[model samples]
Target: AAQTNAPWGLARISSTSPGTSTYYYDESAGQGSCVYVIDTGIEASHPEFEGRAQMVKTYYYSSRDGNGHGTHCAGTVGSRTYGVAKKTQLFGVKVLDDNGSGQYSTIIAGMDFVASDKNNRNCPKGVVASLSLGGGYSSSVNSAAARLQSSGVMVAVAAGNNNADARNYSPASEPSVCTVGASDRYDRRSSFSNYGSVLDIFGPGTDILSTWIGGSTRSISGTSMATPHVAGLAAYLMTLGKTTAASACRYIADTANKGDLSNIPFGTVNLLAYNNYQ
Candidate 1:
């Protein structure tokens, strides 16, 4: 978890090959939707995501721009022209700034921008909001993010990059929010992924190639990377009929790849059943 340069790589430990690849392909071409990235500001000018994403609003907690993290996650979720969630839109929020850190209060403030129409009238309207930040499970986001449920917005968040059993922050741990855990290139859980109960599902968070600032590409690993995959997947499913956050989550729980964790906590989501929705 040390400070790494742009384009960090995942240290492989499991085998997510065929199934993982297949899942990505399956979800990529399903529904045409949009997602909001509540992280650092993205390089809205990257060719891969160029015209695909619209920077209609921003919640700059600090002055950070041209950073690579936001661009990377944004690329994975909606840079489909380069081949990902090609049929989706992306909204960049600068809560973390360029330094890659922010306060819980500011984070919540950014989340508010999406859930509240007064802040960002065009943030998503009715799309899913994807967040890669977490701060050890709290109730703050319950009112901010969960409130969107009443308005039909799907909020997705990273479970955390810590390889521990404890849950991560306000939005992610909120039962109403979609919490995503990280998996290696082989589909096995990432060594650094936070596990147990809080994890609603898993996806590619290891060695993922995404867009960066100044027209560059880099690979990064974290639950941060994994969250967007689910957000995009849910967006595609939404296009097929599963519109509500609850409905999309049900599809994930019923279709994801899993082992014998039926009795274990934070069990696997259903990736296999996702195709049925499409």
Candidate 2:
């Protein structure tokens, strides 16, 4: 099955479209870069991955993705049909379980592994760690995210779906990680998404189409779905020589469409993620 058109979320990012769309992108978009899905394990066999998805580490009893959360996030970041960076390598770093729950220690372990692997490997474009899970603020988790950034791995995390201030959550609240909120195709903040100063950017997430557990597709909503778009773009930017975490994050933030989104809560920047496309 060939994918002809872009997913709406994908089409939304390439242009600064408060009122426009398309997945216009460089043919070499994010090729050779890497993205670690730091959530539930991914289904590496999913056709959408084209064998580019592999397991980096798994904190769960089985590396298989019974939850499908990470699989969906991976698809958004680099799947062939529903992706931001089609050629980027995808690594499944399972931190949460099939139940989509994990202790902070387990999550941090996955993060450290990404840092160590990135420092030792040779991804010419750079690596991005995409975390789609969150809970109440934890200094330990936030510190690990910071260390991951300092290690040069671009980190993007979901602002929780609590519809409250994002600063109340870990990693999302961590200033170093690219904290992302949810938006809809209508260019309005998703009513269920967390907001405030901690969110660095917003991405399309409502009723989003993506890969599912059994080689199928699903349309779910959350700040979780919002994150991988930022992660994928970070990898794409790194391919253009924005290899460091800071450089990729800054490029994504600075190139974002300012003041185009509606209902941006107080303290949340109105920056909507953009790929610098026309």
Candidate 3:
């Protein structure tokens, strides 16, 4: 099976779509893979999700989205209109509350839930953890990311909205996880995105439009938004048999669309471009 087209973000990253001979694997689109978003929860009923979104776990109050951040991020991960992997199952692991604030321990717990087989069953093939939230470096969060990666889960984290080096942040600094920075529609890094040797890739983020709370659509920006594009790509890659973080990372680094990102202070960061998922 093969598809001739994909969403703009996905098309920008990969040279081919699923179903095409250029890249055919699960055809489930991303059915065999799951994306767990750790943020402010999701508006599970949003039309963009087509009922594919659900809240499987929460650390603070409720898993339902109150701030709209999680919904937006989730949409970018799997929504039919804005996602990289349109058919991937999307789960909400709400570590941040309605106020969009949470502790490091809560984040670690969220990662553990997604990594534990006893906790989730939808993604037997693989799981991609999308963390749009960020903070100062924490050993616990870093260790949790390492553990999750070692356990076969691919983790994608926001490089942080601050322009500072991502090394100052937790999961972004976690060497095992993929740290994502924000890129505009023109393929240039967003002014607010954190950059450095820590950043693994850059994704579409500026004024990114996707599902929002109250069953609406919105446009927001940040490394937070950029993270899910990578998460979705990771899910798509997993569906194509790149099941482990290391393999997926290698594939991404080896096949990413190479370009000049001299506009970014970090010099040149590889854009998250996919070439036939080879």
Candidate 1, 69-144: lDDT as tens digits: 8778878777743324456777777788677777788787787676664244443324777888777666776566
Model 2 RMSD in Å is 1.9
Per-candidate TM equals 0.79, 0.96, 0.88
How would you order the candidates by lDDT, starting with the best?
A: 2, 3, 1
Which of 1 and 2 is the better model by TM-score? 2
lDDT of each: 0.63, 0.87, 0.78
Error of 2 at 45 (Å): 0.5
Please state every model's RMSD to the true fold in angstroms: 6.2, 1.9, 3.8
lDDT of candidate 1 at residue 117, scale 0 to 100: 49
Best by lDDT: 2
> Where does model 2 exceed 4 Å of error?
1-4, 18-21
Where does the lowest 10-residue lDDT sum fall in candidate 2? 1-10
What is model 1's C-alpha RMSD?
A: 6.2
| Candidate 3 backbone collisions, by pair | 1-19, 2-19, 2-20, 3-20, 13-274
